[PDB]
Amino acid sequence: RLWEVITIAAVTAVVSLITIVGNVLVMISFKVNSQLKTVNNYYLLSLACADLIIGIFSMNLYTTYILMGRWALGSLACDLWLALDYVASNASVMNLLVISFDRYFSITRPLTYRAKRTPKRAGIMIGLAWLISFILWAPAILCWQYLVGKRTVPLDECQIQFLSEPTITFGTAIAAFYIPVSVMTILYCRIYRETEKRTKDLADLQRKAAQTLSAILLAFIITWTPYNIMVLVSTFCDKCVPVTLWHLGYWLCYVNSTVNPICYALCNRTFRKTFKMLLLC
Amino acid sequence: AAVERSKMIDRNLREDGEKARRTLRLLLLGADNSGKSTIVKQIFETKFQVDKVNFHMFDVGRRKWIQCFNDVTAIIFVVDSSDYNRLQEALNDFKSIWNNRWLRTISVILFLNKQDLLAEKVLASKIEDYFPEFARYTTPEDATPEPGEDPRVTRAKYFIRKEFVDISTASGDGRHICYPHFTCAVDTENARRIFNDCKDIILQMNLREYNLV
Amino acid sequence: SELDQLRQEAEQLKNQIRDARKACADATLSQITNNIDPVGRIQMRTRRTLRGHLAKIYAMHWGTDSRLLVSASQDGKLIIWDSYTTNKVHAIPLRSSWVMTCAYAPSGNYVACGGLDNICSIYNLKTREGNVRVSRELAGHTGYLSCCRFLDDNQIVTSSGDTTCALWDIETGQQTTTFTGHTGDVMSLSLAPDTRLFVSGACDASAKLWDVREGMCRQTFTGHESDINAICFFPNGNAFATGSDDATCRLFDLRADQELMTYSHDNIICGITSVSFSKSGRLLLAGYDDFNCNVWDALKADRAGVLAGHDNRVSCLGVTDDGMAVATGSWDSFLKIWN
Amino acid sequence: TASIAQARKLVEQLKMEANIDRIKVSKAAADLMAYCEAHAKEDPLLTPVPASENPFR
Ligand SMILES: C[N+](C)(C)CC#CCOC1=NOCC1
């Protein structure tokens, strides 16, 4: 049993190190390259900041919680860690939604949008994403025990208290995952239609969109689906969801934050060149 | 004190750079008597606006100042399709522009001008004498003549386009794309054709931005 | 008849020039400078980076001192920098954004500007209005302006794209003396330190020495195999170096009237944009198209160092009057000052 | 008579090029070699100055 938890700790440390160095490289590649200081890469810096908050704080504390079998750090630290984790995860998903909207507007309207891709619109979209995430999760997590009046979460474990209440659970899942994945799927399908359409129109005047565009959506969906399925099944069937399957879903959500740079930042050649510069030193 | 003057200049520099990046710069090229000045009905600079998007066309009244237009959106190349003696010279002029060191990421908006004189010439003067490849050439089955035109006109028009797109498909390999067309003497839709082609150029830049095409 | 006889006489006169140059050759520069020790590895690094432009930067020129440098880009801005503090003294706007050249007066009171607009624009800096005003415009060239240099803050020699060079007068706006000897368009010009002789490099693989008072071509140098778009004098003034698109730098001597040394490297294929010498002239710095600019030993033809600090094509290069620093501007929005 | 006068001036320019003092290369190369050696102490690029005397950092 010691080899199993050593293997789990090693795998979680490797993936936390990978996402930390990836988001640090995306910040450094924006900072040291003035060609990358564009309006559209501010959204990627927002995403990178959210994923770095996830990779530094959330993964390691989660793993230690799984490995020790208990929180053992106080109820206040549990509530603050849960609030920070959920706010950062939702900020990451909101950033993905905002990036998808930016790509959709710059693809379907490539000339009209260029005059509306100002730094003030990018800043207000990033601020709206982070504010929506904070309003959606932080008062719900930190103040549910005062609204109910009792703390039903046991002291040894760390878990959101409203995950038992069906309404708030479905509401905070359809406002955090189902509507964003639906809008992202619709926008990326419309993007695929626009690419096929331009190729046909050009041939009427005179693929790579199958791998990248379908690997972004599947890397989001595979890594965020089982948590959002097990929360909605656990709010009714109390003990259906196994314990190891639950922990794996929770972790997979972090895995998405690990694989986020590769799907958004690394797609841009100027980042790949800056990363090949940065790694070697 | 001098640092604040330099910071006040940088506010004025970024304000002028936003207006410069908000318009599209175009290079107008072509041979003599090809009607370059009559392409748009609205060094010499021409300004016109289509769908609240500002365009800037520049023409110079040989092969050395082409480095100054490395960052333009597109190159508007105008060919006189009426005459055939200078048509081979215009084909070689397009080949040098397409296979240029500083023009590899710059798409070319081709404008085969004077198609009404081309239609009058083929209905009367032999294109086969000036081009031996027009013999044993057939119109493709997926061809749509728009204004109910004669098949001899359509075969002649598709042959002139074909000779200008085998040059474009020989090199480049998707980095920059030639967008052919046809223009009469009194055609007023050239502003929309430039707008639709510059729509595709920025879109292809955006698809390469997101690694989609 | 008469035209064929004059062409045959010119071919015989051209054969006499080649025969006199072959008889004048007795040794090469490498044989004389074989015992001279090399300069070693050059560890020149970027001191200041000027990040105020927004387009491709095509030309720059230093002042009399090593403080103020002018810079011209494709955004229609003629920014005068303070290289000591990386400040911006002036931010002169231009009527035409297509600018291929700029100049700084020896007195420092004026700057020049030119490009595809065929107009040499002189801007007065020391004005009582507190802003830069357009002093004069010189519109006597039928080709695109490629280089311009002030002589004595009243006469400016401009090289244009209509195969002509002209000596101007600022106060009158007229061409004082026109130099018509080139068959290709002229892309480079430099002034000798005594401000009486100058050699212009054109695209016909020929550099012709001119006189600002005689108005006659003193010497013709045909050693290059491609078009020439870079030229600079030796600090001695008895020699000059050229830069072509053949990836070759050639040093020509005025008294010897032929080529001395070819600074060519077989690894280098791409062309050369701008050349300049050091204070003593032993270091020849050439701006290439492989995103970097190299430092060449002017007496040993060895690549002394690589100034790899640009991610785009370097287009201009300037060395101060006292040789304290070298500033290279490239096709990005940056000027980088070295040492 | 413009072509005749331009051809006459091109001959006179070639005559001015022929009537010049052609100093030998070995005397000419020794002048640039001695000029480089005499001014080598005053070159801040060939001889690296210390950071106190250098105004650039
Ligand atoms: C559970 N974990 C903290 C690992 C991730 C989370 C969360 C809640 O917010 C979101 N769920 O999916 C989309 C955003």
Side-chain angles (χ1 to χ4, degrees), chain A residues 2-206 208-238 240-281, chain B, chain C, chain D:
Chain A
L2 178 60
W3 280 260
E4 187 74 26
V5 300
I6 281 173
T7 309
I8 286 302
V11 165
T12 50
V14 166
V15 184
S16 177
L17 185 62
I18 280 177
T19 178
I20 278 172
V21 303
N23 294 284
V24 159
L25 279 195
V26 168
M27 291 175 173
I28 289 175
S29 62
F30 181 96
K31 181 60 178 56
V32 311
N33 205 321
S34 304
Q35 200 177 352
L36 283 178
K37 295 184 177 54
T38 68
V39 186
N40 46 35
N41 289 304
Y42 291 157
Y43 292 138
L44 272 61
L45 294 174
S46 178
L47 181 66
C49 293
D51 297 327
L52 197 56
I53 294 176
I54 290 173
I56 288 177
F57 295 99
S58 305
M59 300 197 191
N60 293 337
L61 289 195
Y62 192 42
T63 307
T64 57
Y65 170 76
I66 302 302
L67 286 186
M68 292 194 304
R70 45 153 193 163
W71 186 243
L73 287 182
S75 64
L76 183 64
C78 170
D79 298 354
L80 288 178
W81 170 69
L82 284 172
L84 176 63
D85 197 359
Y86 276 69
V87 159
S89 295
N90 196 239
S92 182
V93 169
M94 279 320 113
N95 271 330
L96 295 199
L97 189 66
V98 165
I99 289 172
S100 74
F101 268 107
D102 174 68
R103 289 158 174 254
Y104 172 78
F105 287 146
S106 72
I107 281 168
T108 57
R109 299 292 180 85
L111 289 181
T112 309
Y113 191 64
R114 257 177 62 247
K116 297 176 182 178
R117 215 170 192 180
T118 59
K120 169 174 166 297
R121 296 292 180 86
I124 197 178
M125 284 300 291
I126 288 165
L128 203 56
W130 281 86
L131 192 53
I132 279 170
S133 295
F134 182 82
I135 285 169
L136 173 62
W137 289 107
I141 294 170
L142 298 173
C143 302
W144 196 251
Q145 56 183 19
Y146 304 106
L147 190 137
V148 175
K150 62 180 180 295
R151 178 184 182 85
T152 77
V153 173
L155 192 61
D156 48 352
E157 79 171 25
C158 195
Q159 189 182 1
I160 318 283
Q161 183 160 177
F162 57 79
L163 291 188
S164 52
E165 181 80 1
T167 63
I168 184 76
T169 299
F170 295 166
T172 51
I174 293 170
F177 171 65
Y178 291 117
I179 290 177
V181 73
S182 176
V183 170
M184 272 171 85
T185 303
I186 289 303
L187 290 191
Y188 282 144
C189 283
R190 288 183 183 173
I191 280 178
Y192 186 78
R193 295 312 173 183
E194 294 290 334
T195 64
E196 297 302 320
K197 176 183 177 54
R198 62 178 295 275
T199 295
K200 180 59 164 60
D201 292 0
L202 176 62
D204 295 359
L205 228 55
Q206 269 179 354
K208 183 62 66 68
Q211 290 87 19
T212 305
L213 189 63
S214 293
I216 288 181
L217 284 169
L218 294 174
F220 181 74
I221 280 173
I222 281 182
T223 49
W224 277 105
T225 302
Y227 173 68
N228 291 295
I229 292 304
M230 292 183 286
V231 63
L232 273 65
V233 175
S234 63
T235 191
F236 295 160
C237 193
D238 60 301
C240 269
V241 168
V243 177
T244 52
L245 190 59
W246 175 267
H247 297 334
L248 284 184
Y250 213 98
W251 224 90
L252 270 183
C253 295
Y254 298 142
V255 162
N256 172 252
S257 306
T258 298
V259 303
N260 265 338
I262 295 169
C263 297
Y264 287 94
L266 277 70
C267 280
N268 183 0
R269 294 183 181 277
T270 324
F271 276 95
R272 269 194 298 261
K273 180 188 302 301
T274 318
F275 287 157
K276 289 296 183 182
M277 190 260 293
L278 278 175
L279 294 174
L280 63 82
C281 297
Chain B
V3 180
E4 277 192 10
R5 187 203 172 92
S6 162
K7 284 301 187 304
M8 195 170 311
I9 281 170
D10 286 21
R11 292 180 179 90
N12 290 355
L13 283 182
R14 265 176 280 102
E15 277 192 16
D16 282 4
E18 281 165 9
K19 306 215 304 298
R21 219 169 70 250
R22 217 172 59 205
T23 182
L24 298 187
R25 280 160 314 125
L26 301 167
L27 173 62
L28 175 64
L29 290 175
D32 310 324
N33 315 333
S34 56
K36 330 186 303 166
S37 51
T38 66
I39 284 299
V40 175
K41 303 295 176 63
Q42 282 170 9
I43 191 166
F44 178 58
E45 312 177 353
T46 312
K47 288 175 52 62
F48 69 101
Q49 196 182 47
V50 180
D51 280 339
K52 295 183 296 300
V53 188
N54 288 313
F55 300 99
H56 283 79
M57 296 180 56
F58 308 96
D59 48 349
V60 183
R62 289 185 47 84
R63 298 191 176 187
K64 182 63 69 177
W65 48 265
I66 196 68
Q67 319 175 340
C68 308
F69 299 98
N70 188 35
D71 57 334
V72 296
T73 302
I75 289 172
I76 302 173
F77 193 68
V78 187
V79 187
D80 202 341
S81 297
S82 58
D83 48 3
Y84 302 103
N85 291 261
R86 307 178 46 83
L87 186 49
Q88 185 47 243
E89 181 198 8
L91 273 167
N92 296 317
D93 194 18
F94 177 63
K95 193 193 302 182
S96 67
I97 285 165
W98 188 265
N99 303 271
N100 201 288
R101 296 180 181 173
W102 324 107
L103 318 174
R104 291 176 176 178
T105 71
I106 297 176
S107 296
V108 174
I109 306 180
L110 181 72
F111 267 101
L112 303 175
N113 209 11
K114 302 200 180 53
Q115 80 164 301
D116 52 353
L117 289 179
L118 168 65
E120 198 265 335
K121 266 205 181 180
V122 300
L123 286 182
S125 64
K126 299 171 188 176
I127 182 172
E128 297 174 351
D129 289 24
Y130 290 103
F131 277 113
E133 292 179 351
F134 189 63
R136 310 150 308 179
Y137 177 63
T138 58
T139 303
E141 301 314 298
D142 51 354
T144 45
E146 313 93 2
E149 47 185 5
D150 191 292
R152 300 173 182 179
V153 182
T154 309
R155 190 170 63 117
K157 284 177 47 178
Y158 271 55
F159 181 69
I160 304 307
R161 190 195 309 122
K162 184 188 77 171
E163 297 291 328
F164 274 93
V165 300
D166 53 55
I167 302 176
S168 72
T169 53
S171 185
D173 310 326
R175 298 188 317 269
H176 64 306
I177 297 169
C178 182
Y179 297 85
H181 294 275
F182 285 96
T183 304
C184 300
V186 292
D187 208 10
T188 57
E189 310 171 353
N190 302 322
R192 302 292 319 182
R193 288 163 171 162
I194 293 166
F195 172 68
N196 294 342
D197 292 354
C198 284
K199 223 183 176 181
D200 212 314
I201 289 154
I202 297 301
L203 171 61
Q204 196 198 358
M205 283 180 44
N206 286 342
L207 289 182
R208 208 182 330 270
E209 183 74 38
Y210 310 140
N211 194 0
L212 299 173
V213 185
Chain C
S1 175
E2 304 172 356
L3 200 61
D4 176 68
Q5 185 257 358
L6 284 155
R7 280 166 187 183
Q8 283 300 316
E9 190 191 348
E11 282 163 357
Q12 194 53 55
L13 279 166
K14 208 64 180 295
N15 188 83
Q16 283 162 8
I17 292 300
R18 184 206 60 184
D19 289 1
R21 284 164 173 183
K22 281 173 181 176
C24 195
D26 47 348
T28 79
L29 176 59
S30 61
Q31 298 155 0
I32 306 297
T33 51
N34 198 12
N35 49 352
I36 305 300
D37 290 344
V39 305
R41 271 302 300 186
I42 294 300
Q43 311 277 354
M44 195 175 312
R45 59 171 305 272
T46 296
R47 298 307 163 105
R48 325 279 185 172
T49 301
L50 310 178
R51 325 165 170 274
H53 275 298
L54 278 151
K56 313 165 294 170
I57 298 144
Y58 280 1
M60 56 86 59
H61 201 233
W62 283 94
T64 288
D65 45 353
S66 308
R67 294 209 52 141
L68 302 183
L69 62 88
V70 74
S71 73
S73 176
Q74 293 273 274
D75 54 355
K77 289 299 180 175
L78 188 72
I79 304 174
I80 294 175
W81 305 80
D82 205 333
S83 63
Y84 278 5
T85 62
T86 73
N87 282 151
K88 299 197 189 55
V89 184
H90 293 110
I92 308 164
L94 317 163
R95 283 200 173 188
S96 163
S97 55
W98 311 109
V99 166
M100 305 184 60
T101 181
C102 70
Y104 210 96
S107 83
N109 306 343
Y110 292 88
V111 285
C113 186
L116 302 186
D117 56 335
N118 311 325
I119 289 177
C120 196
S121 301
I122 310 295
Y123 302 94
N124 195 7
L125 309 176
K126 317 294 194 218
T127 52
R128 305 184 186 182
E129 297 174 349
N131 278 331
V132 189
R133 204 180 36 88
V134 192
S135 182
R136 277 297 182 86
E137 283 177 349
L138 318 172
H141 280 300
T142 58
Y144 65 98
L145 274 173
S146 53
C147 188
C148 53
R149 285 300 173 264
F150 288 97
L151 273 169
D152 50 349
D153 214 13
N154 201 17
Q155 297 172 344
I156 170 169
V157 181
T158 58
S159 78
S160 52
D162 49 0
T163 76
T164 54
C165 294
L167 165 66
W168 285 91
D169 197 284
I170 291 163
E171 290 176 349
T172 79
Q174 306 162 348
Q175 285 189 351
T176 303
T177 300
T178 313
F179 316 102
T180 67
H182 278 296
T183 59
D185 50 351
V186 187
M187 290 289 305
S188 63
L189 189 144
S190 173
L191 278 178
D194 46 4
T195 72
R196 218 179 179 170
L197 272 65
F198 75 101
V199 189
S200 56
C203 288
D204 50 356
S206 162
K208 289 184 142 294
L209 161 68
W210 298 93
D211 294 347
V212 297
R213 294 184 181 176
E214 315 298 318
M216 295 176 182
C217 172
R218 272 202 180 177
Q219 281 168 335
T220 309
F221 297 89
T222 50
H224 269 304
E225 292 174 349
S226 295
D227 57 356
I228 306 167
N229 66 96
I231 204 163
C232 71
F233 280 96
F234 213 74
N236 194 18
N238 299 132
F240 70 101
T242 55
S244 68
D245 282 344
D246 213 24
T248 51
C249 290
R250 300 181 191 269
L251 171 73
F252 298 96
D253 191 273
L254 269 75
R255 295 160 300 181
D257 211 10
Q258 65 182 177
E259 182 184 350
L260 303 183
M261 186 159 269
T262 301
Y263 314 105
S264 76
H265 198 195
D266 49 349
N267 191 31
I268 306 299
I269 303 169
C270 63
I272 309 156
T273 54
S274 60
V275 291
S276 182
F277 271 118
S278 71
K279 176 70 162 44
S280 61
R282 200 165 152 82
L283 290 193
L284 175 59
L285 277 80
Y288 292 85
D289 292 357
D290 54 358
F291 287 2
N292 321 308
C293 61
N294 309 345
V295 180
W296 282 95
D297 208 328
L299 300 187
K300 296 197 74 65
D302 294 347
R303 193 184 189 173
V306 187
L307 264 53
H310 279 298
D311 44 0
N312 214 334
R313 191 187 94 124
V314 57
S315 62
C316 46
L317 195 140
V319 184
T320 72
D321 280 353
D322 56 356
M324 288 303 304
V326 178
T328 75
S330 161
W331 277 14
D332 50 358
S333 47
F334 305 132
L335 282 82
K336 294 209 167 174
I337 304 161
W338 309 78
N339 278 345
Chain D
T1 178
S3 174
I4 320 174
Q6 276 294 323
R8 189 187 317 174
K9 285 300 290 297
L10 190 148
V11 164
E12 284 178 2
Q13 277 321 291
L14 271 170
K15 281 175 182 174
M16 284 299 116
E17 290 185 27
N19 302 329
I20 204 66
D21 292 331
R22 278 186 165 85
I23 299 170
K24 300 182 181 180
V25 177
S26 57
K27 198 183 302 302
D31 290 346
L32 279 73
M33 175 187 56
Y35 186 78
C36 280
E37 272 190 350
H39 287 241
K41 309 182 176 184
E42 311 172 10
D43 205 348
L45 300 171
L46 168 62
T47 301
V49 294
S52 177
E53 198 187 357
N54 171 46
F56 293 88
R57 289 171 177 169

